């Protein structure tokens, strides 16, 4: 069954790898309780952020990126996000029984307007889910001099240039959130760190688990790092084969989002959606589905091509 | 801003003798780590797996071995931590009764979760609670730091009353029983355990709770989605299928421990009847620091507490260590 669903990584992780993991681990260090983040993994974190102004004190690290997302909205009086994003800031708010407030975004993706300001937190997934949009620095610097907290959820960073991190030279209300389930095809490791002031890390450090992350865990982090190269050369791939198959899709007439994600969204109505939904699946190919259309994750140039064949006999 | 008082995030310094944290002396099988990569999918790791396993939860009521409990009965967590962490967040109320696993407090305000610490009785027992339904009350079997074992009509007290019972069993390995059977009457109950203690794998936080199928299908609601890596399920289930390696181990933890005791009380030392692995020690604090500072002269690291010090069980030749360095006092 053909997935492109989850926006996970074609590539499975190097074998090679996995063996340095596996030769680099202490068995007499699976008893103990390991320190959550790594002295050294911490170290590797900010030569990949690559940064003059960020330290130690600057990083942290949470249990896949949602933890990150999952403990934030407990130390904060309100969390804000804007539908159509990260189908998950609904849910796990309603977990943890946070106080949220949903306001769609604008008929152009925009960021809207509403109160938020300190005592706030908003999540905004830039490259957004599950358009792929990219949001412009000037938009959340708007958010930024609401005095509000931004929580922004740079997941997809790799897949796209930059990355507004360095807004943390002069806002200290901020916090980059970023993981390996994309890039590094670490989705099952479950490991993703956040990038913000001293007095944040501090804070998030005290209500997040003291052990959130595995010893194997930030072991697989830190050698993806010393390999970065490696997964730069696939999301490159990643990318390239992205920016294809939506120059494929709009020939075909279909309407679609600039996404800079390891995915493409394809916009189009309720009825004639679900339509193509049962038709890919008597082709045992699977998307994302939404609200507004469909979001398709990228695969092996196979997978690709399928999409773009058996979208075609269909509009 | 938000500044809060809660304690600040550490890393335990640990000496070139750690008994302070209760972990298994002895490293993961060296043998069990290779199967582990042999199993581990390199296709896998790519994908967000299942956190709760489907074979991890048959391994693991394979490990339960009863008839009642079903895999709609079961699920894992990031370490009976996170099991703790998010169940605090289910209830309106969390009771726990000090002494008691420290972390439970701690939690609680990481959480802001709302809680009520009722003390036990000088004879380690639980006391009048005005508990009842809405409530969630923590109840560590065998205790921390005491290890003493609750008596069962102690548990089912609180059960009848309708709240809702956290039965922590994290140490369940060094004891005999268990109440998970407590499940075929009530369901206001779970069972928290863990592979970290008598399986040498707390550095791959991995817990999980027992409990009945109306909660489960809650917690899961509840708990994030993947909070289980997958090779971190690896390492729990192949571990399963190697238990008599470890129960070997957890019989050296209980031999040594009851050795240990027997040994303390000659000393004339007044120790609990610890059922987990490690003893707790009764001290006269201004005396009882005169020990720590002893220890601490000698690189060696034990659990400072209110009433004495909790020892965990290491190997044999530290184990010996204890014993001598507590005759000269
Ligand atoms: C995929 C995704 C996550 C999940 O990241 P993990 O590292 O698997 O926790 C979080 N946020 C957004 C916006 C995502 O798209
Ligand atoms: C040590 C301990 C825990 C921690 O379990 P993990 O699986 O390491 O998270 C939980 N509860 C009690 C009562 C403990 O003593």
Excluded: W
């Excluded at 959130?177 to 002031?197: C, D, N, P």
Aim: aromatic residues 14%; contains cysteine; charged residues 30%.
């Amino acid at each position: 069954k053909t997935y492109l669903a989850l926006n996970e990584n074609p590539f499975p992780f190097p074998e090679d790898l996995v063996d340095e993991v596996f030769r680099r681990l202490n068995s007499d260090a699976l008893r103990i309780y390991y320190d959550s983040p790594d002295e050294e993994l911490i170290e590797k974190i900010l030569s990949y952020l690559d940064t003059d102004f960020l330290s130690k004190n600057n990083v942290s690290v949470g249990n896949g990126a949602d933890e990150i997302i999952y403990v934030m909205m407990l130390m904060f009086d309100r969390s804000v996000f804007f539908p159509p994003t990260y189908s998950c800031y609904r849910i796990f708010a309603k977990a943890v029984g946070a106080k949220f407030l949903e306001v769609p975004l604008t008929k152009d993706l925009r960021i809207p307007e509403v109160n938020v300001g300190e005592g706030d937190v908003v999540f905004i997934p830039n490259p957004n889910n599950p358009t792929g949009h990219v949001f412009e620095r000037e938009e959340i610097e708007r958010i930024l001099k609401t005095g509000a907290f931004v929580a922004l959820d740079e997941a997809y960073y790799e897949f796209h240039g930059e990355s507004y991190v360095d807004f943390l030279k002069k806002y200290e209300n901020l916090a980059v959130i970023r993981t390996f389930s994309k890039a590094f095809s670490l989705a099952a490791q479950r490991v993703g760190y956040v990038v913000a002031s001293e007095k944040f890390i501090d804070a998030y450090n005290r209500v997040r688990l003291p052990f959130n992350v595995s010893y194997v865990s930030q072991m697989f982090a830190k050698v993806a790092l010393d390999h970065r190269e490696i997964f730069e050369e696939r999301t490159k791939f990643i990318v390239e084969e992205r920016e294809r198959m939506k120059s494929a899709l709009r020939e075909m007439g279909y309407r679609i989002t600039d996404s800079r994600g390891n995915f493409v969204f394809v916009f189009m109505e309720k009825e004639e959606k679900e339509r193509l939904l049962e038709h890919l699946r008597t082709k045992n190919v699977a998307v994302r589905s939404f609200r507004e259309g469909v979001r398709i994750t990228i695969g092996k140039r196979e997978e690709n091509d399928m999409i773009l064949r058996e979208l075609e006999v269909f509009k």
